[PDB]
Amino acid sequence: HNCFCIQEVVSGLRQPVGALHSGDGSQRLFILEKEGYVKILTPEGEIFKEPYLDIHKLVQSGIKGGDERGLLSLAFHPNYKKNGKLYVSYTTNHDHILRVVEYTVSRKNPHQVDLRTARVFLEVAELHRKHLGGQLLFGPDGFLYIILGDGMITLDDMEEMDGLSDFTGSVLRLDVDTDMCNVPYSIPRSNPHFNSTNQPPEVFAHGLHDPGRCAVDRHPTDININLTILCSDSNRSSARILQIISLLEFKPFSNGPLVGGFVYRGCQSERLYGSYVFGDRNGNFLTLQQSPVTKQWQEKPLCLGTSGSCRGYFSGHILGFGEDELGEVYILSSSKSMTQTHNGKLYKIVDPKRPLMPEECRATVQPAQTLTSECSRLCRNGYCTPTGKCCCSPGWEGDFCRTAKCEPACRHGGVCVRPNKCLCKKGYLGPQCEQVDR
Ligand SMILES: [Cl-]
Ligand code: NA
Ligand code: NA
Numbered sequence: 173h174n175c176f177c178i179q180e181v182v183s184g185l186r187q188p189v190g191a192l193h194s195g196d197g198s199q200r201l202f203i204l205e206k207e208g209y210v211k212i213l214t215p216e217g218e219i220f221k222e223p224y225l226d227i228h229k230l231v232q233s234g235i236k237g238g239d240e241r242g243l244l245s246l247a248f249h250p251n252y253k254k255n256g257k258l259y260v261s262y263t264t265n266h267d268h269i270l271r272v273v274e275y276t277v278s279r280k281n282p283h284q285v286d287l288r289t290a291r292v293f294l295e296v297a298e299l300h301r302k303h304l305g306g307q308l309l310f311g312p313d314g315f316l317y318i319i320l321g322d323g324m325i326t327l328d329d330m331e332e333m334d335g336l337s338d339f340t341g342s343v344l345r346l347d348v349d350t351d352m353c354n355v356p357y358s359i360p361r362s363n364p365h366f367n368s369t370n371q372p373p374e375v376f377a378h379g380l381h382d383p384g385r386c387a388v389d390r391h392p393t394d395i396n397i398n399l400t401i402l403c404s405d406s407n408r409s410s411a412r413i414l415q416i417i418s419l420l421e422f423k424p425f426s427n428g429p430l431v432g433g434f435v436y437r438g439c440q441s442e443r444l445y446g447s448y449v450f451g452d453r454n455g456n457f458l459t460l461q462q463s464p465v466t467k468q469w470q471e472k473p474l475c476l477g478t479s480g481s482c483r484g485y486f487s488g489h490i491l492g493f494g495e496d497e498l499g500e501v502y503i504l505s506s507s508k509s510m511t512q513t514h515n516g517k518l519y520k521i522v523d524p525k526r527p528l529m530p531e532e533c534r535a536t537v538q539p540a541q542t543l544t545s546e547c548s549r550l551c552r553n554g555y556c557t558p559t560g561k562c563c564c565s566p567g568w569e570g571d572f573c574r575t576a577k578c579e580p581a582c583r584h585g586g587v588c589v590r591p592n593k594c595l596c597k598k599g600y601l602g603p604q605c606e607q608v609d610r
Contacts, residue, residue: 175477178486178503178519182219185211185516188504189243190385191494196253197538199497203518206242207233208262212283213518215537225275225285231262234301241268244306249348249558250314256543257558258285259316259348261306263298270296270304272318274348274356276556279548282540291555293346293356296337300324303382311399311416312390315360318344319403322381342378343401343414353563364418377418382406385432385493387448392437402460404430404450411469424460424469428452431490438499439533441523449474449501453489479524486519494518498535550574567591580604
């Protein structure tokens, strides 16, 4: 009598890999498709016909099972409501490269990102097509964590090939909130290699092999602990943890290989609040609890059962998980039958013991607005940083890169119209208007 149940929410996805919201109040859910798409699902349950992001041309997907290449992850800037910034990680065309790129939603349309605004941050080289990782997330510190798998690169493979990474197998951590204009991302002071020119400054921890989706506790009440990141891993199946006030390798699981996990922070289940949930491909879930007393970890199983329309099974295999803005969680699934007809699916987890909309859970949809920041309206000739800093293209300047540069200057009422281009009035001639007619 303690089971949870599963509700189908949408079908007809193409090989979904996960889903998340954008923290802008709009209760939109962004569904990632592996071939390279992000679709929008409204709180009313419509899927928009135009992708929010369509980069299937840049991304090298993959056909075989086990071929982990495609769109990997998506993270929205913590202040996206204002700056319209998002970060994606995909694999593109030494087998391939794993980019991590910043994009900016379009200025004219809240529901489509401006493909022109790409702004690459990392490019990690890859020899194989497994153990990639790619999970992006923002901690409450405001920094950008990137969990990378070892790419199954050996120490052999690393010493006899220059142009590898030192990044693979690691949790990197960046400060995207830079005012600098010459390097894409700053580096946190707290980093365990700030300025150190031996081990790479981005790295914040390492030794991950084949991580799944990693649970992320943001400790809203817990004032002592800042962020905990808990990862399933194979190579057989084990956990790895990270707490912030360099990672520890236990094994609380006693069965097969997990897809990943999540920390439930929703409102609809009371019983489940704060729990760490992990699941496998076939939908056997478990919870993890730390003993306050001994700090040891225990798996309790968590079961599914039918309760009305809300079933105790779902079809296909789990590929990923999803969390909406209200904190409710989803399963993304597909099969070999499912994937051939684009019938991947989004299911919601429900606590049948509680109402679907308890008084405490109501919330008012705040419809996504056109980008409004100062930097967005004015910075034409360059690019904005997340902080509002306009970073001029080459040959421009001024606060918002509005005024053009000419070395040398324009003369006889000339006018520096675009970089090294003078408008001469009628009658002076030349590159800089320096010669007079006749
Ligand atoms: Cl907490
Ligand atoms: Na949203
Ligand atoms: Na805190």
